[PDB]
Amino acid sequence: MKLSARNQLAGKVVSIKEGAVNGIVVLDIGGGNQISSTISMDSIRELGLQVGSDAYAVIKATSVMIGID
Amino acid sequence: MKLSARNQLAGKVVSIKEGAVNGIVVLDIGGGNQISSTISMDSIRELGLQVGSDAYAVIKATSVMIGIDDW
Amino acid sequence: MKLSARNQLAGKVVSIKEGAVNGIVVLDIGGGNQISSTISMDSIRELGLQVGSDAYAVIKATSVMIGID
Amino acid sequence: MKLSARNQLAGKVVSIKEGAVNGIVVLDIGGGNQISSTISMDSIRELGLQVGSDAYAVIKATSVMIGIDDWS
Amino acid sequence: MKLSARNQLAGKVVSIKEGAVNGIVVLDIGGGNQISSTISMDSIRELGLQVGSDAYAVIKATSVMIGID
Amino acid sequence: MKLSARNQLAGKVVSIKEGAVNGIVVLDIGGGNQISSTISMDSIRELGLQVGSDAYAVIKATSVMIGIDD
To answer: Which residue intervals define the domain Mop in the entry (chain D) (predicted)?
Structure first.
């Protein structure tokens, strides 16, 4: 599928913390930036995610806030 | 303030597209990646955002999905 | 791509309301159900969406609440 | 109450996956479509949700993305 | 309807700023706190919201972050 | 940090329900109102949140729906 979401950031999975219904996937997207994703364990298994998997952090623009110092 | 949001990615404003109640801020976060953020115009003003401003893309972990090519 | 989101509902576009930076896409997903999606105008154009286009409503499970009468 | 959410889809609960703080409710909304909802276990209890209960999947329009096929 | 959303905060509308597809409703919920809600203009009209309307701010728990000084 | 999020509500932690990857922080914001927050356990530890901590409920405006009595 092709998605409307303005943010689709390629990266490699560096860790997966598993829970009973959800897990937290950490993605290295390069340049020293990491994105953490809290998603269902069902989706983590269905996508075959492992440490080292290539993937994308997918974020709708309306979910992104801006901060300043 | 210190925020629980797992994703707080430093970057520079590349563009601001203004609307009536919301606008879209594009952040260059390095490594060739940019993040687009849809936020209220009042917040864009209150935060003093301009092209070239230093800022952060702030994202709650429960807002991030994962995709794969699945070739 | 293949997306983690638990909800990926095929449907046909029945209306598009254009705004300044966002628009509202309405999808007929069958069974008398329609879904409205508020997304950026850039994504509406980049995806080539028109009335009658085939598309999908994509929703993360953590975005869905449950109600009862 | 009456809710602003543009998406309020009637359906029947077909499964509930219970966890420690959250659970996943799957709603059959007809036409071959199902909606999965991740919500707190306390909410599942307070609403008395069971397999077979009537309910609604409630989704804010700003939470819905659109996809198209890869070959479009 | 009765909603799963853990946050349902009673208040009065103190401001409505209208846009083309969305608007922003500000609700005074007491104690000096106001909650701003960005929702579709259709919902604003359909709920009959005006300055002075009684309403509720409804927020899913997974949408709420915590901050500290 | 200064956040664009239009909703930033001061309160005191009255409870934390811990899970394996997320927890639920209940914040008393006064006037009889509470805010519940489902966030990662890493964040709860990273902010040192405990019962009695002063904190803020932070909500993006696009995350808030409005309801009315019918």
So the answer is: 2-68
Rounded CA-CA distance A61/B61 in Å is 14
Residue A31: count of CB within 10 angstroms of its CB: 12
Residue ranges of the alpha helices (H) in chain B? Answer: 41-46
How far CA E67 is from CA of B59, E18, F4, in Å, comes to 13, 30, 13
- Judge residue A42's burial from the number of C-beta atoms within 10 Å of its C-beta, 0-12 exposed, 13-18 middle, 19 or more buried: middle
Q: Which residue has the tokens 């394996």?
A: F20
The reply to whether A30 touches chain F by the CB within 8 Å rule is no
- Resolution to 1 decimal, in Å? 2.3
Residue type, A2: K
CATH class of domain segment(s) F7-56: mainly beta
Answer whether B4 sits within 8 Å of E69, measured CB to CB: no
Tokens 């927020």 belong to residue: E59
State whether residue F45 sits within 8 Å of chain E by CB.
no
d(CA E7, CA E37): 13
Method: X-ray
**What CATH fold (topology level) applies to the domain C7-59?**
OB fold (Dihydrolipoamide Acetyltransferase, E2P) (2.40.50)
Q: Which residues of E touch D5 (CB under 8 A)?
A: 43
Q: Does A30 touch chain B (CB under 8 A)?
A: yes
Angle at A27 between CA A26 and CA A28, to 5 degrees: 125
The Cα–Cα gap between B58 and B10 comes to: 9
- CATH code that applies to domain E7-57: 2.40.50.100
Q: Which fold has domain A7-60?
A: OB fold (Dihydrolipoamide Acetyltransferase, E2P) (2.40.50)
Strand locations in C1-69 (E): 2-3, 7-18, 22-30, 33-40, 54-59, 65-68
CA nearest neighbour of A36 among B62, C2, C6, C4: B62
Backbone angles phi, psi at A9, to 5 degrees: -110, 115
Q: What single DSSP character describes residue E32?
A: T
Neighbours of chain A (3+ CB pairs under 8 A): B, C, D, F
Which sign does the torsion angle of CA B42, B44, B49, B50 carry?
Answer: negative
Q: Which residue has the tokens 């508020």?
A: C38
